[PDB]
Design a protein around this ligand. Structure first.
Ligand SMILES: O=C1CC[C@H](n2c3ccccc3c3ccccc32)C(=O)N1
Ligand SMILES: [Zn+2]
Length: 111
């Protein structure tokens, strides 16, 4: 027997294994799921956009300050299990209304 199922379709927190998202939810915001972005202190992040995610904990009220995505406010997204910073939740825009910009290098891909 073999298991017949995708090998790299689920994204989990690299630190604790919490289920976070799926390859099926990758979202090409501005024509690419991948964005290389800088914050006000010059830190460069590599963000992957997903339409849906789970297992996160969103901290604080939304902010538009230095938002990387036009029309969206952001909230910090932690791993709800281990508290690792996994990226940001975006809300208040359109097509879609909400989505997640996740730090790709803090996720592990698997079956
Ligand atoms: O869309 C976004 C998400 C937040 C991000 N970002 C940081 C990301 C990491 C650490 C600090 C900050 C920070 C502080 C003030 C305003 C935005 C900030 C940013 O630039 N844009
Ligand atoms: Zn975690």
């Amino acid at each position: 027997q073999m298991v017949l199922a995708p090998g790299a379709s689920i994204f989990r927190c690299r630190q604790c294994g919490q289920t976070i998202s799926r390859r099926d939810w990758l979202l090409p915001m501005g024509g690419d799921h991948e964005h290389v972005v800088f914050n006000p202190a010059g830190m460069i992040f590599r963000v992957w956009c997903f339409s849906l995610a789970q297992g996160l904990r969103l901290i604080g009220a939304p902010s538009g300050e230095f938002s990387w995505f036009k029309g969206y406010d952001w909230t910090i997204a932690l791993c709800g299990q281990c508290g690792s910073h996994l990226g940001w939740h975006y809300e208040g825009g359109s097509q879609p209304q909400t989505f997640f910009g996740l730090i790709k290098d803090r996720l592990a891909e698997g079956p």
